[PDB]
Amino acid sequence: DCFSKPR
Amino acid sequence: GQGPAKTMEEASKRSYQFWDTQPVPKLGEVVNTHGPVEPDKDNIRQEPYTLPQGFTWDALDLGDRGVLKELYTLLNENYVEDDDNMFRFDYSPEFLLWALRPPGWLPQWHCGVRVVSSRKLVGFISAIPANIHIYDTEKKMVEINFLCVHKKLRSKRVAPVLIREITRRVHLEGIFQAVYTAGVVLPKPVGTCRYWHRSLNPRKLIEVKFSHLSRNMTMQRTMKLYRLPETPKTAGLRPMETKDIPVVHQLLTRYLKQFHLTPVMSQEEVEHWFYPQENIIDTFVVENANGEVTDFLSFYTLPSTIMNHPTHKSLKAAYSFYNVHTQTPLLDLMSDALVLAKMKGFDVFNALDLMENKTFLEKLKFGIGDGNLQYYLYNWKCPSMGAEKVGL
Ligand SMILES: CCCCCCCCCCCCCC(=O)SCCNC(=O)CCNC(=O)[C@H](O)C(C)(C)COP(=O)(O)OP(=O)(O)OC[C@H]1O[C@@H](n2cnc3c(N)ncnc32)[C@H](O)[C@@H]1OP(=O)(O)O
Ligand SMILES: [Cl-]
């Protein structure tokens, strides 16, 4: 996994 | 120290001084064939690649408690962050043993870099064996994960050394292809998947600024939007047990045949990857009125440290793993997954748009994320695929 947060 | 690209158009400007030397397709090269980029080498370099002065190789025995602690600390302080330096993954020691010691793990594939004078751990990269189905080919490969360079070592070309050295150590075992993922664009993605996020505790997520309030939406409105049932609804949902290992393997094997990039798990691998370990991996099977297991859902635990917030220290995230349905609608199965993660105290439920996830992401109130997961093959040339064909 890499990092993501809600757009 | 020219930096990484996040979109393909950003990748168009860049030149890849290292990846241009590697057996991977060039970006923009249209691929209409299936096979290795180069033939297998039948004589392999015996000597480790040269590190810059003052650094040395050391294979990490993760069975040594102190050594496993050194690795957790390196990753806890230097691994994947968000762009705004607010969250960093918090891989636990038991999670690292789960991810880094599956069946067939090899000690030389836990490849660390230490400072010569102090023995301080400042670099790492790992391989685990993985049988990979890619289109019409099943091949023994490795999966490369946990590439990490200490922040004080950044932009000094240490990652190319780690990549070449783990390549050499894999070549020694007779394997010439690898699969890996990354949030940056490199030559050349075989598939691009997008993260989606299902808020479980919206108040905390907004407090620590993981998510934000919608333009005209209040906190009270948001909490009501994401409110879940208190208990699951699928008949016969229960945690996976030892007796379910065979049928879970059977369900997963048949289910993955419809995608184009999937792992091929032995029954021992299914046991390792799916048998529940608290705060690591949860698997729930559906046992029907006849006593037969027809579906299962699974998600793993990966918390993130919150860098600077006065009241919250850890973001507890669940990541969708594999979800197989034959009798329970996938929408019902993933709805129960959200409820089970909510009951277990998770703050957010993360999933990618791969496999059939697009069929339920919007309907279960997932919101699109700003991060992609790029899928890659090393030394294998094949056409790209849409996210719905990625099953890895
Ligand atoms: C057959 C067996 C084969 C086995 C090998 C299969 C391939 C394995 C491939 C690895 C699979 C990894 C899977 C995971 O673990 S993905 C997780 C990666 N880890 C992190 O993002 C943690 C935070 N970042 C770091 O620790 C460092 O910034 C890293 C180590 C990422 C780069 O260190 P640094 O910032 O100090 O840079 P440099 O000066 O040393 O080196 C610059 C070169 O590195 C290329 N680069 C940058 N990021 C990545 C990346 N994420 N994958 C592959 N290459 C990457 C970059 O484009 C440039 O090449 P080019 O642009 O000149 O061409
Ligand atoms: Cl080990």
Author numbering:
A (entry chain C): 3 to 9
B (entry chain A): 102 to 493
Question: What do the authors say?
Answer:
Glycylpeptide N-tetradecanoyltransferase 1, commonly known as N-myristoyltransferases (NMTs, EC 2.3.1.97), are universally conserved eukaryotic enzymes responsible for a major post-translational modification (PTM), myristoylation (MYR). NMTs are thought to transfer a C:14:0 acyl-CoA (MyrCoA) exclusively to the N-terminal glycine (Gly) of specific substrates. Here we report a series of high-resolution HsNMT1 structures co-crystallised with MyrCoA and reactive substrate peptides. These structures reveal snapshots across the entire catalytic mechanism including the reactive intermediate state, thereby providing the high-resolution map of MYR reaction chemistry.
To challenge the primary importance of the water molecule channel in mediating Gly2 deprotonation, we created two truncated NMT1 variants in which the last 2 or 3 amino acids were removed. Accordingly, using an in vitro MYR assay, we established that the truncation does not alter the protein turnover rate (kcat) and observed a significant reduction in the enzyme’s relative affinity to the peptide.
